[PDB]
C-alpha cells in the first residue's frame, strides 16, 4: 500500500522520490499530500458575460 511520489528538488548536492504509507482507516488522520491544483483566476478577474479579448476595445 505504499505511495511513491517525486520531490521537486531545490538545492542539489535523476528524480528523487519519497514514500508514504497511511497508517489509519480515516482519511482525516492522513497527512496533507501538498499535491495541489491551480486554476485560472477568471471567475474573479473576468466574471463578464461576454468574453474579453484584451487587444480589442472593452466597450464597443
Amino acid at each position: 500500500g505504499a505511495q511513491v511520489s517525486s520531490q521537486k528538488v531545490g538545492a542539489h548536492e535523476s528524480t528523487i522520490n519519497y514514500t508514504t504509507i497511511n497508517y489509519y482507516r480515516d482519511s482525516a488522520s492522513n497527512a496533507a499530500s501538498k499535491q495541489d491544483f491551480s486554476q485560472d483566476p477568471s471567475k474573479f478577474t473576468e466574471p463578464i458575460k461576454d468574453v474579453l479579448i484584451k487587444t480589442a476595445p472593452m466597450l464597443n
Binding site: D36, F37, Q39, L52, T55, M58
Partner: protein, 283 residues
C-alpha cells in the same frame, strides 16, 4: 492538470508596435481586471520562467498550527468556598486573531482539523514541597452531552465522548477530526438569525443574536488534572493549536482591517483608523 508547483509562464520576446490593437486601454466599469502582461505595453526579451506558486496554494497558506486558546487548570484541595480548578472552553477559532484573519479571507471552508496540545506547569507557592508528574484529561463534550460540574464527577468516565489522557513532559498531544459541519461547508460569515420573530409572539420570545447560528456550534473541551491534590499548589496551562488540513475555500473577502471586537464583524470606537499619513506626491 496545472499543479501548484508548476513554473509560471515564460516571458515571450516582443518588439515595437504600431496598430489598432489597444491592450493598454480598458474599462473597469465592466467589473473585469485587464489581463495584461509586460509584453503588451513594453518591449520584452524571452525569459524562461522557473518560479512557481507552490507556497501560496490554499493548503500551503494554511499548513500551520495556530494557537486558538489557553486553558487554565490547577491541582488544589477543593474546600467549601473554592473547588479544584478544571477548565471548560467553547471550541472556536475566534478567541484569538491570527488564524481567524486568515480563514476570513474566505466566506466558506471545508477542512479536516488537527489539534495539538502543549501543556506547561508551575508551582505557585513558595514552599519547597513537591508534586509528582501530572496526568491531564482533555475531554471533548459535544453539544448535548453532560458538561462536567466538578473535577471528579461521573462525566469524566467518558464512555462515549473522546478523551485524551496526556502525561506531563511527554510529546504534545495530537488528534485529528474530519470535516464535522452540519452544512456542506463551514460558514465563516452567516448573514442571518437563528430565529424568525413572529408577530403573534413576544419580542423576547422571537429574539436571537445577529449572525449566530447554532448556540453550541461545536461543543466544549473540558480539561482536568486527574491526580489528587498535593500539599503544594501547581498551576497548569493547556495551549491549543489548530491546523486546517485538506482544505477547500470559497468566495474571497477583503481581510479584517480594524481590530476584532467580538465573534461578529462589529468594531470598536477609536480603532477605526488603520491607515497612516502619507502625502500624495511624496515617495
Amino acid at each position: 492538470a496545472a499543479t501548484s508547483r508548476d513554473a509560471l509562464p515564460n516571458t515571450e520576446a516582443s518588439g515595437p508596435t504600431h496598430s489598432k490593437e489597444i491592450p493598454a486601454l480598458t474599462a473597469v466599469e465592466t467589473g473585469a481586471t485587464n489581463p495584461l502582461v509586460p509584453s503588451d505595453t513594453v518591449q520584452t526579451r524571452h525569459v524562461v520562467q522557473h518560479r512557481s506558486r507552490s507556497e501560496s496554494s490554499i493548503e500551503s497558506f494554511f499548513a500551520r498550527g495556530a494557537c486558538v486558546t489557553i486553558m487554565t487548570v490547577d491541582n488544589s484541595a477543593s474546600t467549601t468556598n473554592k473547588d479544584k480548578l478544571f477548565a471548560v472552553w467553547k471550541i472556536t477559532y475566534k478567541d484569538t486573531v491570527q488564524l481567524r484573519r486568515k480563514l476570513e479571507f474566505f466566506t466558506y471552508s471545508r477542512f479536516d482539523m488537527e489539534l495539538t496540545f502543549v501543556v506547561t506547569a508551575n508551582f505557585t507557592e513558595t514552599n519547597n514541597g513537591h508534586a509528582l508528574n501530572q496526568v491531564y484529561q482533555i475531554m471533548y463534550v459535544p453539544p448535548g452531552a453532560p458538561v462536567p460540574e466538578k473535577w471528579d464527577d461521573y462525566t469524566w468516565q467518558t464512555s462515549s465522548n473522546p478523551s485524551i489522557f496526556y502525561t506531563y513532559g511527554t510529546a504534545p498531544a495530537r488528534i485529528s477530526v474530519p470535516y464535522v459541519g452540519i452544512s456542506n461547508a463551514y460558514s465563516h460569515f452567516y448573514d442571518g438569525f437563528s430565529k424568525v420573530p413572529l408577530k403573534d409572539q413576544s419580542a423576547a420570545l422571537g429574539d436571537s443574536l445577529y449572525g449566530a447560528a447554532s448556540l453550541n456550534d461545536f461543543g466544549i473541551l473540558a480539561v482536568r488534572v486527574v491526580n489528587d491534590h498535593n500539599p503544594t499548589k501547581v498551576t497548569s496551562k493547556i495551549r491549543v493549536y489548530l491546523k486546517p488540513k485538506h482544505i477547500r475555500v470559497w468566495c474571497p473577502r477583503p481581510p479584517r482591517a480594524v481590530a476584532y471586537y467580538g465573534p461578529g464583524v462589529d468594531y470598536k470606537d477609536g480603532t477605526l483608523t488603520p491607515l497612516s499619513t502619507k502625502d500624495l506626491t511624496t515617495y
